[PDB]
From a paper:
Hsp90 belongs to the chaperone superfamily and plays crucial roles in maintaining the stability and the activity of numerous client proteins, including kinases, transcription factors, and steroid hormone receptors. Hsp90 contains three well-defined structural domains: an N-terminal ATP binding domain (NTD) for ATP-binding and hydrolysis, a middle domain (MD) for client protein recognition, and a C-terminal domain (CTD) mediating Hsp90's dimerization. Client protein recognition via protein-protein interaction is the major function of Hsp90α’s middle domain (Meyer et al., 2003, Prodromou and Pearl, 2003). Owing to the involvement in cell growth and the up-regulation in multiple types of cancer, Hsp90α is becoming a promising target for anti-cancer drug development (Garg et al., 2016, Prodromou, 2009, Sidera and Patsavoudi, 2014).
In this manuscript, non-covalent allosteric modulators (SOMCL-16-171 and SOMCL-16-175) targeting Hsp90α’s middle domain (Hsp90M) were developed for the first time. The perturbed residues in Hsp90α upon the binding of SOMCL-16-171 and SOMCL-16-175 both localize to four fragments spanning N360-L363, D372-G387, K443-E451, and I522-E535, which are spatially close to each other. Compared with the binding of SOMCL-16-175 to wild-type Hsp90M, its interactions with Hsp90M F349A and Hsp90M D350A mutants are almost fully abolished, and its interactions with Hsp90M L382A and Hsp90M K443E mutants induce less significant CSPs of the corresponding residues. The mutagenesis study data suggest that the α-helix spanning I522-E535 might not be involved in the direct binding of SOMCL-16-175 and the compound binding cavity in Hsp90M is composed of F349-N360, D372-G387, and K443-E451. The docking model was then obtained, and the binding pocket composed of F349-N360, D372-G387, and K443-E451 for SOMCL-16-175 in Hsp90M was confirmed. According to the backbone resonance assignments data, the region spanning F349-K356 of Hsp90M undergoes slow conformational exchange in solution and the resonances of the residues in this region are fully absent from the recorded NMR spectra. The slow conformational exchange in this gate-like fragment is expected to favor the recognition of the active compounds by Hsp90α’s middle domain. P395-I408 is named as the catalytic loop, which promotes the ATP hydrolysis process by moving to an open active state and interacting with the γ-phosphate of ATP through the conserved arginine residue in the fragment (R400 for Hsp90α) (Meyer et al., 2003, Prodromou, 2016), whereas K362-D372 is spatially adjacent to the catalytic loop and is found to indirectly modulate the ATP hydrolysis process by its intimate interactions with the catalytic loop in Hsp90's middle domain (Meyer et al., 2003). Meanwhile, as revealed by the CSP analysis data, the binding of SOMCL-16-175 would induce long-range allosteric modulation effect on the hydrophobic region spanning K362-D372 of Hsp90α’s middle domain.
Residue numbers in the entry: 294 to 546
Write the structure that this text describes.
Amino acid sequence: KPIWTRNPDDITNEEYGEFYKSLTNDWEDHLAVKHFSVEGQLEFRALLFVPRRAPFDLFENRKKKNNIKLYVRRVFIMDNCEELIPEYLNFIRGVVDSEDLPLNISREMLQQSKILKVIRKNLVKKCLELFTELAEDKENYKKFYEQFSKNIKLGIHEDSQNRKKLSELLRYYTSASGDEMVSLKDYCTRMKENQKHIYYITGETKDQVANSAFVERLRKHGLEVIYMIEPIDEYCVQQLKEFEGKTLVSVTK
């Protein structure tokens, strides 16, 4: 039986790795795996993997198609179905096996398919669920975030429906964090009693921004400033107007 039709409880991580490596020709095994099924009026199984390295630089390679393999009742259909998952998750590798799709479905009907849209929404929900489970382990989440932080920020820009969950996955240096990147929830725990806004500064290097005088000003009060040191962060805070009810404020206003 194909591994994706087996019960996840009975599959070792070495069996997943072996399958992951034959599927992707990676020389390393997966960083993470999410194996699940939906049943009832919609019926399908999915076996998704996060690679240990970003497959390409996302921002210089926009609109790359995902490589998930689509099956119908265990018969391979295609492996470049754009609408199976949104672009910011196009690094996800693996297999989706649908029971209800037409076996003879063309790509143009696939594009219009209501079954494909409900499958896609389930993939996103389970990927985000995987990322949050991965955030429980601080050491391996650092590995994921180094490779895919740009994808999370691209999602914040492009996917308002999940913008809340995605924002919980962000990590940043701050004027109070030293060598560690922290979450917005962590920032919120340290806010002063009177503080009603989340302060950030955008810039180019950690050092130039840590030396900046707008930061020094708030350092003189008991106030923490978030370091946003990549160009997507501009787009990112535009749509991330606030968090936990706290408005985001640039220290340069």
